[PDB]
Design an enzyme around this catalytic site. Structure first.
Site, PDB file in Angstrom:
ATOM      1  N   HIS A  43     -16.278-146.704 -76.805  1.00  0.00           N
ATOM      2  CA  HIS A  43     -16.858-145.994 -77.936  1.00  0.00           C
ATOM      3  C   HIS A  43     -16.899-144.482 -77.799  1.00  0.00           C
ATOM      4  CE1 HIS A  43     -21.062-146.176 -76.103  1.00  0.00           C
ATOM      5  NE2 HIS A  43     -21.159-144.991 -76.671  1.00  0.00           N
ATOM      6  N   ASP A  99     -17.126-152.768 -73.725  1.00  0.00           N
ATOM      7  CA  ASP A  99     -17.072-151.342 -74.008  1.00  0.00           C
ATOM      8  C   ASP A  99     -16.567-150.732 -72.706  1.00  0.00           C
ATOM      9  OD1 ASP A  99     -17.487-148.828 -75.088  1.00  0.00           O
ATOM     10  OD2 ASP A  99     -19.681-148.926 -74.903  1.00  0.00           O
ATOM     11  N   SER A 198     -23.597-141.592 -72.213  1.00  0.00           N
ATOM     12  CA  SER A 198     -22.573-142.629 -72.417  1.00  0.00           C
ATOM     13  C   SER A 198     -21.274-142.498 -71.620  1.00  0.00           C
ATOM     14  CB  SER A 198     -22.209-142.705 -73.904  1.00  0.00           C
ATOM     15  OG  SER A 198     -23.362-142.858 -74.717  1.00  0.00           O
TER      16      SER A 198
END
Ligand SMILES: CCOC(=O)[C@@H](Cc1ccc2ccc(C(N)N)cc2c1)c1ccc(O[C@H]2CCNC2)cc1
Lengths: 244, 24
Positions: A43, A99, A198
Site C-alpha cells: 500500500h 501487504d 508504514s
C-alpha cells in the site's frame, strides 16, 4: 510513532525511508534486507482507494539517515529502485492481506556502520520468538500522534498480543498473514506505529545469536494509540515468496 | 546480519534492549 523515544544513533541500520522524488516527500518506511533488496508494504506503492499507483520513476530511497529533514552527508546513501514487486495476492479492497512488496535497488548499496541488513526469520527463530507477551521493536518517523513530523528517528518496543484478542478488536477480516501488537487497556503503558511509519520493520532480538530478526512490517490499524485497538503488521515469516 | 555495527559489534547494549529480554 506515538509515545516513542529518540533512537540512539545507529540503532536501526536496516531502516530505509521511502521518498517521492519530486516534490520531496517521505512516503513510507522500509527495511534493508540485503545490499540490493528492500522490504516494504504494498500500500505504500499501490492503493487505488486513494488513487495511488507508484512506478519506479516516481520513487527514490534514502538509507542510513537519522533526522527526517537534513541530509546525512557522511552517513546517508541515496539510491534509486530498479524494479518493484508487489505480492500477487495482496488484498486492497478488504483487509490489506499480503501487504508486502520488494524494492530492487538499481545499484547495490555499500554497507557501513550506519547501513546494514536485517535478518529474515527462520522457523526456529520464528517459532521460539513469535509468542504473546514478547515485545518486538518498531521504528519510524510518522505522526507524533494522529491528526506531528518527528525530527530524529523514533523507536518504541511493543508486546505481541494473542490472536483471539486481535481478531476480536476489529470488524476487519484478520488472515494468517498478519499479527498484531500493542499494550492492552490497563497495562499502564502506551505506544504505537502510525500512518507514515508504514512499511517499517517490527523486529525482535534473538538471544541465541544476539541478532535482530525482522518479524513484521507496519501495515494497518485503526487510529494511532487508540485504546482497545492494536496495530497490525504483515507476517514476514508466513511470507518468506522467491522473487529475489 | 542483524548485528548492528555500533552496538552488537562493539559489544554494547542500546537504551531499550533490556525491555526485550526482560519481556522474554
Ligand atoms: C492504507 C489503508 O489504511 C488504513 O487501513 C487506515 C489508515 C491507516 C494507514 C496505515 C496505518 C499504519 C499504522 C497504523 C497504526 N496505528 N499501527 C495505522 C494506520 C492507519
Amino acid at each position: 510513532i506515538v509515545e516513542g523515544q529518540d533512537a540512539e544513533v545507529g540503532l536501526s541500520p536496516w531502516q530505509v525511508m521511502l521518498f517521492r522524488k519530486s516534490p520531496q516527500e517521505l512516503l513510507c518506511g522500509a527495511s534493508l534486507i540485503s545490499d540490493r533488496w528492500v522490504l516494504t508494504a504494498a500500500h505504500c506503492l499501490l492503493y487505488p482507494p486513494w488513487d495511488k499507483n507508484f512506478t519506479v520513476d516516481d520513487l527514490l530511497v534514502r538509507i542510513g539517515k537519522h533526522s527526517r529533514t537534513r541530509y546525512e552527508r557522511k552517513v546517508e546513501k541515496i539510491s534509486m529502485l530498479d524494479k518493484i514487486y508487489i505480492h500477487p495476492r495482496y488484498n486492497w479492497k478488504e483487509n490489506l492481506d499480503r501487504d508486502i512488496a520488494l524494492l530492487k535497488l538499481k545499484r547495490p548499496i555499500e554497507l557501513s556502520d550506519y547501513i546494514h541488513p536485517v535478518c529474515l526469520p527462520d522457523k526456529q527463530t520464528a517459532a521460539k520468538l513469535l509468542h504473546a507477551g514478547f515485545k518486538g521493536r518498531v521504528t519510524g518517523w510518522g505522526n507524533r500522534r494522529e491528526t506531528v513530523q518527528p525530527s530524529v528517528l523514533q523507536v518504541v518496543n511493543l508486546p505481541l498480543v494473542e490472536r483471539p484478542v486481535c481478531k476480536a478488536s476489529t470488524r476487519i477480516r484478520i488472515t494468517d498473514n498478519m499479527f498484531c501488537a500493542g499494550y492492552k487497556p490497563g497495562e499502564g503503558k502506551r505506544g504505537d506505529a502510525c500512518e507514515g511509519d508504514s512499511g517499517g520493520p517490527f523486529v525482535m532480538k534473538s538471544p541465541y545469536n544476539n541478532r535482530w530478526y525482522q518479524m513484521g512490517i507496519v501495515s494497518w490499524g485503526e487510529g494511532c494509540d487508540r485504546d482497545g485497538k492494536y496495530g497490525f503488521y504483515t507476517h514476514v515469516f508466513r511470507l518468506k515468496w522467491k522473487v529475489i | 546480519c542483524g548485528l548492528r555495527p555500533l552496538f552488537e559489534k562493539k559489544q554494547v547494549q542500546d537504551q531499550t534492549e533490556k525491555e526485550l529480554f526482560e519481556s522474554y
